[PDB]
């Protein structure tokens with residue numbers, strides 16, 4: 001039985017809508033505590049630092065799935081920080097309250113790797129070695145120039 | 158959303174001196190590949206004009222193309238107050254972006270120019286300073302240069318125009334030479350070009366008495 | 367999604383001369399009526415202080431508030447370069463807004479001062495100019511004034527500091543009098559306050 005996120009993103013900002021679906025062919029746990037829900041899937045109205053830590057599920061018939069509630073304007077979201085070459089890399093410059101962003105720039109090692117007029121996701125269609133490094137997105141919130149927290153990427157073997 | 162547009166004016170020297178050719182530059186920034194073709198329409202006094210040379214998108218450091226259009230302007234066109242407008246069409250701008258630019262409005266005033274020698278106190282130093290004071294001019298747009306017996310001297314800096322208490326502007330240009338250069342009695346000249354001077358030029362000379 | 371925060375430094379007079387009281391001004395702007403409560407946390411070299419005074423909110427003209435806190439800084443707590451941080455908490459912004467300000471980083475350099483009389487050419491007019499040349503100083507912050515036999519003159523404007531070709535800054539102060547005085551002939555003196563001078567002060571005078 002494997003817990004399954006939706007959106008998968010294990011990294012989220014506050015005021016984000018997180019879902020946790022439990023899969024079998026319900027009772028829950030947070031930080032090894034009992035989730036109120038019985039239903040076949042549990043819902044987070046609005047993310048808060050409280051809801052961090054491990055999450056498990058047990059249908060009548062699991063190994064943890066982590067959650068990070070970061071805080072700020074922008075959050076660079078990728079399914080993982082490690083890929084091996086010829087692997088699609090999908091990044092997402094997620095904004096606080098899905099705010100309409102514009103003039104979005106993804107970067108690496110302090111270097112503009114791509115740009116958009118409106119908030120669009122970054123794809124590196126197949127992962128080279130020269131790709132791994134130090135990333136963060138930045139855009140415009142209202143009239144405010146903001147930037148996301150940094151993440152480390154790694155391509156191996 | 159962009160692209161952002163900036164429009165620039167002729168440097169004054171080009172406008173003032175007949176030998177040179179002035180031009181107005183329309184600069185466009187932040188352009189995506191998804192929307193990289195850019196159109197320019199240029200207007201003088203509201204009548205469209207055709208004679209601008211658009212340069213190639215030069216892609217930037219940050220993943221953005223950069224485009225530029227240049228217009229070639231007549232001297233008595235610009236000094237007469239004409240409005241220059243640039244209209245940029247693009248497939249990311251919902252409505253084209255017009256930016257216009259023109260000469261500074263107001264009666265011109267002919268600058269009085271004065272050259273000032275080094276302070277006696279200064280001599281004690283390796284190098285002395287030579288000052289050109291230009292005051293009394295409107296508009297801010299002026300050009301100031303230095304030369305020594307014909308070559309352009311290359312160690313002078315000029316302070317940006319300062320709004321005077323009387324509505325005119327002023328500036329100071331400091332040229333730095335070697336005291337040795339100074340004592341011999343070399344001749345130094347501060348050269349001023351502004352729209353309010355005959356021939357759009359005047360010269361004032363500074364050497365020892 | 368606001369409000370913005372701009373954080374200003376002290377004017378140099380306040381920092382240079384003991385007598386006065388220098389202060390960094392942390393002004394918060396674009397504060398919405400829906401989210402008007404605004405908290406300030408002040409830090410000096412990373413350590414918090416609470417001797418700051420948040421002023422009465424001033425509603426602005428675009429139908430948005432404007433707020434201001436001032437921190438009073440010890441005179442040498444700035445000349446030594448300590449970073450002053452101003453953390454604005456509010457519910458329009460997901461994360462408090464920190465801004466920082468500090469001294470111009472870099473070795474100080476002694477301003478050289480020189481007083482220049484009018485040109486033989488300018489004497490031919492109803493009013494002549496007196497020039498004070500201040501060159502060779504770092505950092506940019508400086509103060510320049512004119513006086514007449516000790517008292518404050520009222521007819522001078524000052525050029526912005528200009529980066530010299532040797533890493534230094536320089537500027538020009540143009541004092542204007544009537545012709546008569548120069549020949550009066552009265553002593554005038556341009557006075558300069560900067561961190562690289564003895565007692566943070568020096569004076570250069572001009573007569574016939």
Ligand SMILES: *[C@@H]1O[C@H](CO[C@H]2O[C@@H](C)[C@@H](O)[C@@H](O)[C@@H]2O)[C@@H](O[C@@H]2O[C@H](CO)[C@@H](O[C@@H]3O[C@H](CO[C@H]4O[C@H](CO)[C@@H](O)[C@H](O)[C@@H]4O[C@@H]4O[C@H](CO)[C@@H](O[C@@H]5O[C@H](CO)[C@H](O)[C@H](O)[C@H]5O)[C@H](O)[C@H]4NC(C)=O)[C@@H](O)[C@H](O[C@H]4O[C@H](CO)[C@@H](O)[C@H](O)[C@@H]4O[C@@H]4O[C@H](CO)[C@@H](O)[C@H](O)[C@H]4NC(C)=O)[C@@H]3O)[C@H](O)[C@H]2NC(C)=O)[C@H](O)[C@H]1NC(C)=O
Pocket residue numbers: 103105161163165166167168171179180181182184186187217218219221
């Ligand atoms: C992606 O990267 C882009 C490029 O990056 C580079 O540039 C730097 C960042 C560098 O660090 C590297 O990263 C890389 O090199 C980047 O684009 C940038 O976007 C900025 C934001 O829009 C632009 O800022 C504007 O700059 C204007 C000034 O431009 C001049 O000065 C800059 C700085 O030196 C210079 O780079 C420009 O080239 C330009 O120089 C002039 O250029 C003209 C044309 O070539 C020359 O003239 C011609 O010269 C020929 C010579 O052959 C001949 O003589 C012709 O006759 C002559 O016409 C000049 O010689 C040359 N002059 C000089 C001194 O170099 C600013 O005016 C503008 O400011 C205004 O707008 C601001 C808000 O946007 C506002 O805050 C500000 O107050 C101001 O406001 C206006 O305010 C006025 C009064 O204050 C009012 O009067 C107005 O009404 C008001 N108007 C408006 C609309 O508000 C602005 O700051 C920047 O130029 C641009 N950089 C480049 C290289 O294009 C992009 O942002 C990046 N994207 C992302 C997402 O990060």
Ligand SMILES: *[C@@H]1O[C@H](CO)[C@@H](O[C@@H]2O[C@H](CO)[C@@H](O[C@@H]3O[C@H](CO[C@H]4O[C@H](CO)[C@@H](O)[C@H](O)[C@@H]4O[C@@H]4O[C@H](CO)[C@@H](O[C@@H]5O[C@H](CO)[C@H](O)[C@H](O)[C@H]5O)[C@H](O)[C@H]4NC(C)=O)[C@@H](O)[C@H](O[C@H]4O[C@H](CO)[C@@H](O)[C@H](O)[C@@H]4O[C@@H]4O[C@H](CO)[C@@H](O)[C@H](O)[C@H]4NC(C)=O)[C@@H]3O)[C@H](O)[C@H]2NC(C)=O)[C@H](O)[C@H]1NC(C)=O
Pocket residue numbers: 370371372373374375376377380388389390391393395396426427428430432
């Ligand atoms: C709704 O209506 C609002 C109301 O009017 C409006 O508010 C304005 O918002 C503007 C932003 O949109 C904001 O603009 C900023 O202005 C900064 C300078 O402001 C000073 O000068 C202005 C004149 O040009 C004044 O109007 C301002 O009030 C302010 O005046 C200064 O005030 C301080 C403290 O009050 C004072 O200091 C104290 O003085 C006393 C004297 O009694 C003592 O001496 C004390 O010891 C001393 O502490 C100053 O003397 C006084 N100065 C003057 C000249 O009077 C300007 O700096 C900002 O620019 C920066 O940011 C922009 C980005 O937006 C950059 O493009 C720009 O490059 C600047 O970035 C700085 O660059 C530096 C390098 O040069 C760098 O070092 C900095 O790090 C960098 N800073 C940043 C943050 O990046 C900016 O233009 C304006 O001030 C607001 N008006 C007021 C009155 O506050 C609001 O926007 C409206 N909203 C809408 C939606 O319409």
Ligand SMILES: *[C@@H]1O[C@H](CO)[C@@H](O)[C@H](O)[C@H]1NC(C)=O
Pocket residue numbers: 030031033049050051052053054
């Ligand atoms: C669970 O642990 C996380 C840290 O991993 C904490 O942020 C959160 O507040 C805790 N929640 C509960 C209900 O204990």
Ligand SMILES: *[C@@H]1O[C@H](CO)[C@@H](O)[C@H](O)[C@H]1NC(C)=O
Pocket residue numbers: 102103104105138139140145146
């Ligand atoms: C963002 O702010 C940064 C400041 O470093 C600057 O590089 C960039 O031009 C600004 N604009 C956008 C749209 O990212």
